[PDB]
Design a protein around this ligand. Sequence first.
Ligand SMILES: *[C@@H]1O[C@H](CO)[C@@H](O[C@@H]2O[C@H](CO)[C@@H](O[C@@H]3O[C@H](CO)[C@@H](O)[C@H](O)[C@@H]3O)[C@H](O)[C@H]2NC(C)=O)[C@H](O)[C@H]1NC(C)=O
Ligand SMILES: *[C@@H]1O[C@H](CO)[C@@H](O[C@@H]2O[C@H](CO)[C@@H](O)[C@H](O)[C@H]2NC(C)=O)[C@H](O)[C@H]1NC(C)=O
Ligand SMILES: *[C@@H]1O[C@H](CO)[C@@H](O[C@@H]2O[C@H](CO)[C@@H](O)[C@H](O)[C@H]2NC(C)=O)[C@H](O)[C@H]1NC(C)=O
Ligand SMILES: *[C@@H]1O[C@H](CO)[C@@H](O[C@@H]2O[C@H](CO)[C@@H](O)[C@H](O)[C@H]2NC(C)=O)[C@H](O)[C@H]1NC(C)=O
Ligand SMILES: *[C@@H]1O[C@H](CO)[C@@H](O[C@@H]2O[C@H](CO)[C@@H](O)[C@H](O)[C@H]2NC(C)=O)[C@H](O)[C@H]1NC(C)=O
Ligand SMILES: *[C@@H]1O[C@H](CO)[C@@H](O[C@@H]2O[C@H](CO)[C@@H](O)[C@H](O)[C@H]2NC(C)=O)[C@H](O)[C@H]1NC(C)=O
Ligand SMILES: *[C@@H]1O[C@H](CO)[C@@H](O[C@@H]2O[C@H](CO)[C@@H](O)[C@H](O)[C@H]2NC(C)=O)[C@H](O)[C@H]1NC(C)=O
Ligand SMILES: *[C@@H]1O[C@H](CO)[C@@H](O[C@@H]2O[C@H](CO)[C@@H](O)[C@H](O)[C@H]2NC(C)=O)[C@H](O)[C@H]1NC(C)=O
Ligand SMILES: *[C@@H]1O[C@H](CO)[C@@H](O[C@@H]2O[C@H](CO)[C@@H](O)[C@H](O)[C@H]2NC(C)=O)[C@H](O)[C@H]1NC(C)=O
Ligand SMILES: *[C@@H]1O[C@H](CO)[C@@H](O[C@@H]2O[C@H](CO)[C@@H](O)[C@H](O)[C@H]2NC(C)=O)[C@H](O)[C@H]1NC(C)=O
Ligand SMILES: *[C@@H]1O[C@H](CO)[C@@H](O[C@@H]2O[C@H](CO)[C@@H](O)[C@H](O)[C@H]2NC(C)=O)[C@H](O)[C@H]1NC(C)=O
Ligand SMILES: *[C@@H]1O[C@H](CO)[C@@H](O)[C@H](O)[C@H]1NC(C)=O
Ligand SMILES: *[C@@H]1O[C@H](CO)[C@@H](O)[C@H](O)[C@H]1NC(C)=O
Ligand SMILES: *[C@@H]1O[C@H](CO)[C@@H](O)[C@H](O)[C@H]1NC(C)=O
Ligand SMILES: *[C@@H]1O[C@H](CO)[C@@H](O)[C@H](O)[C@H]1NC(C)=O
Lengths: 149, 162, 81, 55, 276, 198, 50
Amino acid sequence: PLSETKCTLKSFTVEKGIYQTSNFRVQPTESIVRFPNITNLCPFGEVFNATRFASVYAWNRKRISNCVADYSVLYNSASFSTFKCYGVSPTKLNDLCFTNVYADSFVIRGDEVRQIAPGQTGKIADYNYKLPDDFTGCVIAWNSNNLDS
Amino acid sequence: FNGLTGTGVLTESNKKFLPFQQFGRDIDDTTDAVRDPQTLEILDITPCSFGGVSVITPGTNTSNQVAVLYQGVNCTEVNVFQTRAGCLIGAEHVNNSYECDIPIGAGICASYQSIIAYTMSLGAENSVAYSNNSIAIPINFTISVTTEILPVSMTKTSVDCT
Amino acid sequence: NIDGYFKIYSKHTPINLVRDLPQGFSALEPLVDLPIGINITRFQTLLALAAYYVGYLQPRTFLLKYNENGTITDAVDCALD
Amino acid sequence: AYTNSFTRGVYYPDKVFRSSVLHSTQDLFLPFFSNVTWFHNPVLPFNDGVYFAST
Amino acid sequence: MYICGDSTECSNLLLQYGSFCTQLNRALTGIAVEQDKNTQEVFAQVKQIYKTPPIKDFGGFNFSQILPDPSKPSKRSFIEDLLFNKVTLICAQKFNGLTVLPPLLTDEMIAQYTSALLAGTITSGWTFGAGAALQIPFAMQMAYRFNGIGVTQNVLYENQKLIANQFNSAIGKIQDSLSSTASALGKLQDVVNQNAQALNTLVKQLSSNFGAISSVLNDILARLDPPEAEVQIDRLITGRLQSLQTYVTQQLIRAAEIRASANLAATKMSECVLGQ
Amino acid sequence: LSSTASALGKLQDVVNQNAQALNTLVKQLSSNFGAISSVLNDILARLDPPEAEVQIDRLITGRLQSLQTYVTQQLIRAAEIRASANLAATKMSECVLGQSKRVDFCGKGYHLMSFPQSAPHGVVFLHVTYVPAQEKNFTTAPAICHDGKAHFPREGVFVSNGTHWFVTQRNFYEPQIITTHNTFVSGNCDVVIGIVNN
Amino acid sequence: LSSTASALGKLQDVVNQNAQALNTLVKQLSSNFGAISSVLNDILARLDPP
Ligand SMILES: *[C@@H]1O[C@H](CO)[C@@H](O[C@@H]2O[C@H](CO)[C@@H](O[C@@H]3O[C@H](CO)[C@@H](O)[C@H](O)[C@@H]3O)[C@H](O)[C@H]2NC(C)=O)[C@H](O)[C@H]1NC(C)=O
Ligand SMILES: *[C@@H]1O[C@H](CO)[C@@H](O[C@@H]2O[C@H](CO)[C@@H](O)[C@H](O)[C@H]2NC(C)=O)[C@H](O)[C@H]1NC(C)=O
Ligand SMILES: *[C@@H]1O[C@H](CO)[C@@H](O[C@@H]2O[C@H](CO)[C@@H](O)[C@H](O)[C@H]2NC(C)=O)[C@H](O)[C@H]1NC(C)=O
Ligand SMILES: *[C@@H]1O[C@H](CO)[C@@H](O[C@@H]2O[C@H](CO)[C@@H](O)[C@H](O)[C@H]2NC(C)=O)[C@H](O)[C@H]1NC(C)=O
Ligand SMILES: *[C@@H]1O[C@H](CO)[C@@H](O[C@@H]2O[C@H](CO)[C@@H](O)[C@H](O)[C@H]2NC(C)=O)[C@H](O)[C@H]1NC(C)=O
Ligand SMILES: *[C@@H]1O[C@H](CO)[C@@H](O[C@@H]2O[C@H](CO)[C@@H](O)[C@H](O)[C@H]2NC(C)=O)[C@H](O)[C@H]1NC(C)=O
Ligand SMILES: *[C@@H]1O[C@H](CO)[C@@H](O[C@@H]2O[C@H](CO)[C@@H](O)[C@H](O)[C@H]2NC(C)=O)[C@H](O)[C@H]1NC(C)=O
Ligand SMILES: *[C@@H]1O[C@H](CO)[C@@H](O[C@@H]2O[C@H](CO)[C@@H](O)[C@H](O)[C@H]2NC(C)=O)[C@H](O)[C@H]1NC(C)=O
Ligand SMILES: *[C@@H]1O[C@H](CO)[C@@H](O[C@@H]2O[C@H](CO)[C@@H](O)[C@H](O)[C@H]2NC(C)=O)[C@H](O)[C@H]1NC(C)=O
Ligand SMILES: *[C@@H]1O[C@H](CO)[C@@H](O[C@@H]2O[C@H](CO)[C@@H](O)[C@H](O)[C@H]2NC(C)=O)[C@H](O)[C@H]1NC(C)=O
Ligand SMILES: *[C@@H]1O[C@H](CO)[C@@H](O[C@@H]2O[C@H](CO)[C@@H](O)[C@H](O)[C@H]2NC(C)=O)[C@H](O)[C@H]1NC(C)=O
Ligand SMILES: *[C@@H]1O[C@H](CO)[C@@H](O)[C@H](O)[C@H]1NC(C)=O
Ligand SMILES: *[C@@H]1O[C@H](CO)[C@@H](O)[C@H](O)[C@H]1NC(C)=O
Ligand SMILES: *[C@@H]1O[C@H](CO)[C@@H](O)[C@H](O)[C@H]1NC(C)=O
Ligand SMILES: *[C@@H]1O[C@H](CO)[C@@H](O)[C@H](O)[C@H]1NC(C)=O
């Protein structure tokens, strides 16, 4: 402790008195985690395996709750072209627990896929489907040239 | 707990929850009580001990030993002596009362004659011999000279911006 | 009905008056929450094999006071006077 | 007919336990000292919510 | 502990802002130290500790309302108890960082100081401020005090009973005023109210976005990747720093006037109680 | 004064406070504040305007905050020093150019006179005071009634050494015999409590 | 009082200090502060929210 006092005063001599050096805290160990019993698999795959998609002006809206979401199996898939993810993170989605999930599915041309992003205007982002000014999960776009072409 | 991350110690709580709450908050945003998602009981949370450290020293020029005071910590979990302003390690307790040079707090202070902590004494105690039929008059006098120091000004400094 | 959520609260207490709503305070504890997401503009009541009041809610700022056991005892409406 | 709604229409806004505190909140409430319209099957409006009493 | 709640990376970012933390701790420590000298210089003006004798022959004056009461946990008098009742333990440091330190002089020592001052004043006049206390009967001390404002001393010796009764009645009349009008002690409550309001604002200004995405550090640190979390960790340090700086500045400014009031009280004790 | 040290703590503390404040202000000039470097020369000589202006803005706002903090602290300290100087001027005007009657103002005792002396950044007062000593305690009385007339002392107090009565001043023991030139008569000795025949 | 000037120095100094402080506070609204324009309605009327 005398060395701590010398460091704080920046001198080799200390005079009579009381000095404050630092503070201490108790280090916690043995982390604990609690989660509910619900363990039913979730139909995420069907969302990507809908044989028919919808137009831009009438986009398919789906609600997801009471699931055990798995994104690690979805992230490692290389079938997607872009996975630009605003809001939170690509990889830290397995440690967060949400309330509800909204899936908005449709099909767009290749020249407007960039326009699907918060806080920007354009043609299809202003008159057809506008994202809000805050984070909304994130977007996924994948090419299909064997079903609708 | 379901995305609620925290640190502290968990204890069996006593406050009663209505069947539709999930957790409580003492004031503003202080999550203290939580209901677990599986076994459905209530557990209150409080942070474990932490606080500052102070060093009491008689001076390097005199000696080479110190005492350590932990502020506001009941050190049953860290010659330990429990005070009202934390607790003191490295000092011994005595009954005698002197006038001390290193004040600690709550009427307790320490000094070196090694490194003893005691209760300060206000001063010498005496009783005046009051009576309704007697006075006391001086016979001699002394002339004393006292000094006092008063500052009047400090240095003049001008600092530019650009 | 807010942001695609239908919420239903309720309460049930007996009263001694026989004229109208009595003088007193009583909080409402929730019963049902539903994730429906629908537009509602009108409503109607059904009968069994007659007498009911209807009031409309508005946005407002309140000051609630809690007792020791966690139950609301009284409230103050800021924009009244 | 019309009647005075003296101090009716207070509910729990959140699922958070609180005790011995005063909390200022802002939400959809029924205003103090307003009219409630007594009724007697007519279709009725649903502006932003309905406080529905009975006897 | 206040800005970067029990985090590691936040401290590494705060280390880049220079040393805008030694100044704040030094200023708060200076204020805390000065708060002890303020109390020391007022009461601690008597060298010894006198005490009144069991003899209670003061000529008719009744001082039982202000002399200490042995049958009390704190050995205080009636008026001190009334004052204490009219104004509304190992305390730990909260997670905010707030800490309250105990005073150096406990209330018992203050009571002993005031009792010693009162006993010296009663039994020795003004002679105990210069050198050693010299005893003198209370009637003659009061006669000398009349002789100091123009009135000759034979006025008291022929009106002693009237003056004694008037003094006793005047002393008795103060208990009702103290125990009925609780708003008299308004000078000792505004300080507490102002300090409480300032500290409450400081505490309440922790849950503000300040332009970030969340008001709690753990939420940001558990969602955003470290490469891009650095932008959102900022805009949060630069609001709490301003809050803390404002709190410190107001504390210094309002401590200056407390120092001035303490100096005035010390002067009044020096030349109003010890002498005439 | 020559032997014992640490008798001028206030002036040293003032100088130390000023030095620490100035040193901290100069030391705060070597912080990144979130930029890429702590020197403007490298930033200007290593980049183009579009983001060099961002870096310069960051450094500018940081340094401006530090300078404002220093100025505010200096203002507070100057106010305190002004209060101390006003007190010193009052003491110089009252205790040096005259004689002070207020207790606990100049010295510990009965004030006599004072001498000023200079100092590196202040003033030193030498007070001369009178302090009694070698006490002795006697028997007293409030008044003495002769021929039914109560006599009180003009200025002084009645004392007895054991057999005889004298009148003496309060602050020094100089006994004088009792005559009618130092006592005045008022009334009769029937209402005063403590009358002694003589 | 009626002839010599600069006799009531302190009161005039106080008034001048207050007036100067108020004027320099009012004069700060025209500063750019690093933004595109010092006027708020126009800068709202020439740019998108982002
Ligand atoms: C849920 O139903 C409501 C019905 O009110 C839909 O809101 C819109 O309400 C207006 C009347 O309040 C309907 O009439 C239209 O009013 C506008 C503005 O006065 C007028 O310019 C039109 O000529 C027409 O008279 C309007 O039809 C109705 N909107 C639609 C799409 O029917 C509300 O949109 C419905 N919610 C959803 C999610 O569909
Ligand atoms: C539809 O669901 C199936 C089943 O989960 C997905 O097919 C898997 O795809 C991955 C990567 O392409 C393969 O490693 C698995 O072997 C496949 N499993 C099966 C049963 O076929 C498919 O990816 C989903 N559709 C889309 C568009 O993602
Ligand atoms: C400091 O710690 C000691 C030891 O844990 C405490 O003493 C115990 O206090 C509990 C609570 O009242 C009692 O049930 C035990 O019987 C006590 N044990 C002993 C040996 O005294 C003490 O109360 C703590 N003090 C503070 C202020 O926290
Ligand atoms: C003054 O008269 C009294 C008579 O006893 C003496 O002073 C007191 O002496 C008693 C001795 O029993 C002590 O208990 C008191 O404390 C004394 N009073 C004090 C110290 O104030 C003493 O003999 C006389 N004074 C002198 C100087 O002779
Ligand atoms: C103090 O005052 C008393 C009362 O005026 C004086 O007289 C004494 O009175 C008590 C009873 O009250 C008697 O017991 C004493 O015998 C009385 N004293 C004498 C000498 O007769 C008293 O003289 C005054 N002085 C002292 C030193 O007591
Ligand atoms: C009053 O005090 C002074 C100083 O203490 C006394 O003078 C001293 O007396 C002693 C013994 O008589 C001498 O040895 C010293 O030399 C004297 N000092 C000086 C400076 O002259 C004086 O005697 C005391 N008066 C009485 C009446 O006792
Ligand atoms: C709040 O909770 C307390 C704790 O239960 C209630 O106090 C109880 O009241 C009942 C009814 O009078 C008694 O039979 C119990 O003995 C009480 N408990 C204790 C520990 O004494 C209290 O009634 C509740 N309500 C209010 C308004 O305080
Ligand atoms: C000084 O004042 C106190 C307080 O009034 C007096 O104490 C009273 O004494 C009488 C007689 O024993 C009691 O009936 C009262 O109840 C007491 N008052 C209180 C508040 O308890 C005391 O007697 C007075 N002094 C003298 C010498 O009479
Ligand atoms: C001077 O004033 C005092 C009180 O202010 C008078 O004393 C009062 O006299 C009346 C009439 O006898 C009594 O009823 C009261 O009890 C007395 N008061 C006290 C406190 O003793 C006194 O009479 C006045 N003197 C003159 C000459 O008018
Ligand atoms: C009290 O003072 C008187 C007055 O001086 C003393 O009486 C004198 O004593 C001396 C002793 O040497 C005689 O020479 C004088 O003649 C006496 N004077 C008178 C008028 O009688 C008395 O001795 C003193 N007593 C004490 C105890 O000091
Ligand atoms: C002071 O002297 C007077 C008279 O000179 C005393 O008064 C007389 O005392 C005697 C003895 O007790 C009585 O018989 C008389 O009646 C008193 N009066 C008169 C007019 O003679 C008085 O007692 C003396 N005082 C003291 C304290 O002794
Ligand atoms: C969750 O599962 C555990 C063990 O399977 C069981 O003990 C517990 O009761 C379950 N929770 C609920 C709410 O049923
Ligand atoms: C420092 O130590 C030396 C040697 O022991 C001693 O002479 C001196 O008095 C000490 N100084 C103080 C201030 O104690
Ligand atoms: C005082 O000293 C005695 C022994 O000298 C010891 O037993 C006692 O505990 C001490 N007092 C206190 C309060 O500890
Ligand atoms: C209720 O309505 C009636 C008539 O419509 C009106 O006179 C009365 O003022 C209303 N009540 C309130 C509280 O405004």
